[PDB]
Point group: C2
Chain length 322, copies 2
């Protein structure tokens, strides 16, 4: 049950119980995208500006925006007044030399400081392999307990993002991983739905790799529609917390088709925290043609993209408000 302040914050992040949030806390990933289109290293000024442009042009069409404290603070101050704010709390990436992918908060940040920076939610990404090293997972669970406790104290919603993996499978897009994905996703949600983690909303993957599902696949078919549908019902049965989907490994259209398939299957998901697909194309335009050009792209292609997603969400998502 939400405290008064957490409920107020949840309300600021959604519309009629549905979270239609724009994810733009990309840091290293965004810089790498930018570097594709110019010779000089992308600058802090360029990065901050592009985030500000996306925030200004697209938040009128989003219930909230997720930004990073590193480059995203100016962008947060120019968001639509109707849109709420989440700030990321985790350091990006993971050590490729090991399989542990341990969580680490930004060095000079705390839940209190995230709140003071005007956020209505603390977001934190955790990599989790339910079948992995038990001592590694013990450390991960302890770390999430601390964060959930911070958020309880600061009275600010805790959005926990879970990205699954397997210590022994290098490629999550592989058929090998696809066969175990539902297990990884749904069992991880079951663990992190425990009261002791203090989570208010789970940001999670769809529990199936739709590219291998009958009727969605163009190549090999690993699952029938009924099998895929059962993975969604299992996911729904894994938690009683609000949860929202992130998009990965799929085209904007497939993600939208997945949202429809999810709702048809019985998943009562409560929205999305989705980004790249919507503003991606503006990065090239910003680098090559400049800010005003980027605005124009966002006002046209950007809007068209977010609009189509919104219409789908509007007919697929269920409200977290019971």
């Amino acid at each position: 049950t939400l405290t008064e302040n957490k409920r107020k914050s949840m309300e600021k992040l959604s519309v009629d119980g549905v979270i239609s949030a724009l994810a733009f806390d990309q840091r290293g990933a965004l810089k790498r995208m930018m570097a594709q289109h110019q010779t000089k290293e992308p600058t802090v000024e360029q990065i901050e500006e592009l985030k500000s442009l996306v925030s200004e042009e697209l938040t009128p069409f989003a219930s909230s925006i997720l930004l990073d404290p590193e480059y995203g603070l100016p962008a947060s101050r120019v968001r639509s007044e109707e849109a709420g704010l989440l700030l990321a709390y985790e350091k990006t990436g993971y050590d490729a030399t090991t399989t542990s992918r341990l969580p680490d908060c930004l060095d000079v940040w705390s839940a209190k400081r995230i709140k003071e920076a005007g956020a209505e939610a603390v977001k934190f990404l955790l990599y989790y392999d339910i079948d992995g090293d038990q001592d590694v997972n013990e450390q991960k669970k302890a770390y999430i307990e601390r964060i959930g406790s911070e958020c309880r104290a600061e009275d600010i919603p805790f959005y926990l993002e879970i990205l699954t993996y397997d210590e022994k499978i290098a490629d999550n897009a592989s058929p090998e991983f696809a066969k175990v994905k539902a297990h990884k996703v749904n069992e991880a949600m079951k663990v992190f739905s425990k009261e002791r983690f203090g989570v208010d909303v789970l940001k999670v993957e769809v529990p199936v790799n739709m590219k291998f599902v009958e009727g969605f696949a163009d190549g090999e078919v690993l699952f029938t529609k009924e099998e895929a549908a059962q993975a969604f019902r299992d996911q729904e049965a894994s938690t009683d917390l609000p949860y929202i989907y992130l998009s990965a490994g799929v085209s904007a259209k497939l993600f939208q088709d997945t949202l429809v398939f999810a709702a048809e299957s019985g998943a009562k998901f409560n929205g999305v925290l989705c980004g790249r697909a919507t503003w991606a194309g503006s990065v090239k335009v910003y680098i090559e043609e400049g800010p005003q050009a980027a605005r124009e792209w966002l006002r046209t292609e950007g809007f068209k993209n977010i609009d189509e997603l919104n219409k789908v969400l509007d007919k697929t998502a269920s409200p977290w408000t019971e």
Copy 2:
């Protein structure tokens, strides 16, 4: 100020508003004492036993005991029913290679787990140099905010221990450091007394190296008694929080003399988190004549030691109930 549960825990940690706590969360430092008679590397059993012996024999005469989650959990279960329990949350020691001495919680622990382990307080040691790198201190302040937040959420008193140092002064006991100690201690207390850090009790050094104070000094004299007394008054005015003294670099007798002097100077300290000198003479006896001998040393010399300290506290310490 204190919530109902924090106050109840605070009361379990003290007697008549005075904290006479036995500090015994030493880890590496204790097995190293056990160097006498190097019949192999000290056993985890031995370490857990000595801690249990000390706990069972001495806690009847202390208001609480501080243990480490590493070796001290068995010890904590055999503590007198009249003594409260603090558990250490920080990893011991620091990197000698660098000057940052960054804090770091025990990997598989959280304030929640500490509370679940039966503790009436979370204790955390932070090394702080008020004059050191500004970014390092930013990271340290953020870290303490997080812990302070955890403890608020779990509704458990937060005991912050501050050990001061200087990035550019190797020896803590040097005359050079002595000349700035009061500055380091008192200014750090001012910082961590701010509401945002959520500290309930400060465990701090006396703000002067008494080994250089007129009348207390065996060798050269750096300060008069009036200069020392003022440092104590400055310390009293650096915080409105309850604070207790740790004993460092001095004999049991000198520590006790310092308590008297502190009180005479106008310091309203609320007890101590000490006792290493009360059980110090049993470490050798334990690996010399076995468990039985140690118990006898504790029931005799041990008791005398802690009883003697208690009598000084009765004449010097002020109740935190203020």
